[PDB]
Design a protein around this ligand. Sequence first.
Ligand SMILES: COc1ccc(OC)c(/C=C/C(=O)c2cc(OC)c(OC)cc2CCNC(C)=O)c1
Ligand SMILES: [Cl-]
Length: 118
Amino acid sequence: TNPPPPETSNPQTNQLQYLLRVVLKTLWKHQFAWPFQQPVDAVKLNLPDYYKIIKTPMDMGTIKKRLENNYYWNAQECIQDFNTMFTNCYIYNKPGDDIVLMAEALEKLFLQKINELP
Ligand SMILES: COc1ccc(OC)c(/C=C/C(=O)c2cc(OC)c(OC)cc2CCNC(C)=O)c1
Ligand SMILES: [Cl-]
Protein backbone atom coordinates (compact mmCIF):
# COMPACT_ATOMS: atom_id res chain seq x y z
CA THR A 1 0.00 0.00 0.00
CA ASN A 2 1.13 3.55 -0.76
CA PRO A 3 2.02 5.83 2.15
CA PRO A 4 -0.60 8.48 2.94
CA PRO A 5 -0.11 11.66 0.91
CA PRO A 6 1.52 14.67 2.59
CA GLU A 7 -0.68 16.82 4.81
CA THR A 8 -2.41 19.65 2.93
CA SER A 9 -3.98 21.72 5.74
CA ASN A 10 -2.08 23.66 8.44
CA PRO A 11 -4.60 25.48 10.76
CA GLN A 12 -2.76 35.31 1.20
CA THR A 13 0.22 37.15 -0.28
CA ASN A 14 0.32 38.21 -3.92
CA GLN A 15 3.28 35.93 -4.65
CA LEU A 16 1.40 32.88 -3.34
CA GLN A 17 -1.59 33.84 -5.49
CA TYR A 18 0.80 34.13 -8.45
CA LEU A 19 2.39 30.74 -7.74
CA LEU A 20 -1.03 29.07 -7.74
CA ARG A 21 -2.85 31.06 -10.42
CA VAL A 22 0.06 31.48 -12.85
CA VAL A 23 3.07 29.27 -12.11
CA LEU A 24 1.35 26.05 -11.03
CA LYS A 25 -1.54 26.42 -13.47
CA THR A 26 0.74 26.75 -16.51
CA LEU A 27 2.97 23.86 -15.41
CA TRP A 28 -0.15 21.79 -14.69
CA LYS A 29 -1.24 22.14 -18.34
CA HIS A 30 2.21 21.36 -19.75
CA GLN A 31 2.39 18.11 -21.71
CA PHE A 32 5.09 16.70 -19.40
CA ALA A 33 2.97 17.34 -16.29
CA TRP A 34 1.16 13.99 -16.03
CA PRO A 35 3.77 12.03 -13.95
CA PHE A 36 3.77 14.81 -11.33
CA GLN A 37 0.04 15.61 -11.00
CA GLN A 38 -0.45 13.33 -7.96
CA PRO A 39 1.69 11.32 -5.53
CA VAL A 40 3.74 8.56 -7.13
CA ASP A 41 1.56 5.44 -7.06
CA ALA A 42 4.30 3.01 -6.06
CA VAL A 43 1.80 0.15 -5.78
CA LYS A 44 0.30 0.50 -9.27
CA LEU A 45 3.66 1.36 -10.85
CA ASN A 46 5.26 -1.57 -8.94
CA LEU A 47 8.04 0.50 -7.35
CA PRO A 48 8.56 -1.07 -3.90
CA ASP A 49 11.72 1.01 -3.38
CA TYR A 50 10.36 4.49 -4.20
CA TYR A 51 9.26 5.40 -0.68
CA LYS A 52 12.41 3.83 0.75
CA ILE A 53 14.61 6.20 -1.27
CA ILE A 54 12.34 9.26 -1.48
CA LYS A 55 11.71 10.24 2.14
CA THR A 56 10.17 13.67 1.40
CA PRO A 57 7.78 12.95 -1.49
CA MET A 58 6.05 15.80 -3.27
CA ASP A 59 3.85 16.37 -6.32
CA MET A 60 2.04 19.24 -8.05
CA GLY A 61 -1.32 17.94 -6.83
CA THR A 62 -0.31 18.39 -3.21
CA ILE A 63 1.05 21.87 -3.99
CA LYS A 64 -2.36 22.85 -5.37
CA LYS A 65 -4.13 21.48 -2.28
CA ARG A 66 -1.57 23.32 -0.13
CA LEU A 67 -1.86 26.54 -2.16
CA GLU A 68 -5.66 26.39 -1.97
CA ASN A 69 -5.68 25.88 1.82
CA ASN A 70 -3.13 28.63 2.65
CA TYR A 71 -0.75 25.95 3.92
CA TYR A 72 2.30 28.08 3.12
CA TRP A 73 3.11 31.24 5.05
CA ASN A 74 5.19 32.69 2.19
CA ALA A 75 6.24 32.06 -1.39
CA GLN A 76 9.65 30.65 -0.43
CA GLU A 77 8.08 27.70 1.42
CA CYS A 78 6.03 26.91 -1.68
CA ILE A 79 9.00 27.25 -4.05
CA GLN A 80 10.86 24.73 -1.89
CA ASP A 81 8.14 22.12 -2.48
CA PHE A 82 8.61 22.42 -6.25
CA ASN A 83 12.36 21.95 -5.76
CA THR A 84 11.57 18.99 -3.51
CA MET A 85 9.43 17.57 -6.32
CA PHE A 86 12.06 18.07 -9.03
CA THR A 87 15.00 16.80 -6.97
CA ASN A 88 13.01 13.72 -5.92
CA CYS A 89 12.67 12.77 -9.59
CA TYR A 90 16.41 13.23 -10.20
CA ILE A 91 17.27 11.09 -7.16
CA TYR A 92 15.05 8.09 -7.89
CA ASN A 93 15.28 7.87 -11.68
CA LYS A 94 18.42 7.57 -13.75
CA PRO A 95 19.93 10.39 -15.82
CA GLY A 96 18.86 10.13 -19.44
CA ASP A 97 15.44 8.69 -18.60
CA ASP A 98 12.61 10.47 -20.39
CA ILE A 99 10.96 11.37 -17.08
CA VAL A 100 14.17 13.09 -15.94
CA LEU A 101 14.19 15.11 -19.16
CA MET A 102 10.52 15.92 -18.56
CA ALA A 103 11.33 17.08 -15.02
CA GLU A 104 14.20 19.23 -16.30
CA ALA A 105 11.93 20.88 -18.87
CA LEU A 106 9.32 21.49 -16.17
CA GLU A 107 11.84 23.02 -13.76
CA LYS A 108 13.44 25.24 -16.41
CA LEU A 109 9.98 26.58 -17.23
CA PHE A 110 9.28 26.87 -13.49
CA LEU A 111 12.32 29.12 -13.03
CA GLN A 112 11.03 31.38 -15.82
CA LYS A 113 7.61 31.79 -14.20
CA ILE A 114 9.18 32.62 -10.82
CA ASN A 115 11.71 34.88 -12.57
CA GLU A 116 8.92 37.48 -12.90
CA LEU A 117 6.88 37.54 -9.68
CA PRO A 118 5.57 40.41 -7.48
C1 LIG B 1 -0.49 3.98 -17.03
O1 LIG B 1 0.84 4.51 -16.84
C2 LIG B 1 0.86 5.56 -15.98
C3 LIG B 1 -0.31 6.25 -15.67
C4 LIG B 1 -0.27 7.32 -14.79
C5 LIG B 1 0.94 7.70 -14.22
O2 LIG B 1 1.07 8.74 -13.35
C6 LIG B 1 -0.13 9.52 -13.27
C7 LIG B 1 2.12 7.02 -14.52
C8 LIG B 1 3.30 7.44 -13.93
C9 LIG B 1 4.62 6.96 -14.54
C10 LIG B 1 5.84 7.49 -13.77
O3 LIG B 1 5.69 8.24 -12.81
C11 LIG B 1 7.11 7.15 -14.27
C12 LIG B 1 7.32 7.36 -15.63
C13 LIG B 1 8.55 7.07 -16.21
O4 LIG B 1 8.82 7.25 -17.54
C14 LIG B 1 7.64 7.54 -18.30
C15 LIG B 1 9.58 6.58 -15.43
O5 LIG B 1 10.75 6.32 -16.08
C16 LIG B 1 11.70 5.66 -15.24
C17 LIG B 1 9.39 6.37 -14.07
C18 LIG B 1 8.16 6.67 -13.47
C19 LIG B 1 8.04 6.39 -11.96
C20 LIG B 1 7.94 7.64 -11.07
N1 LIG B 1 9.12 8.52 -11.19
C21 LIG B 1 9.06 9.83 -10.91
C22 LIG B 1 7.69 10.37 -10.52
O6 LIG B 1 10.03 10.59 -10.99
C23 LIG B 1 2.07 5.95 -15.41
CL1 LIG C 1 -1.02 30.46 7.27
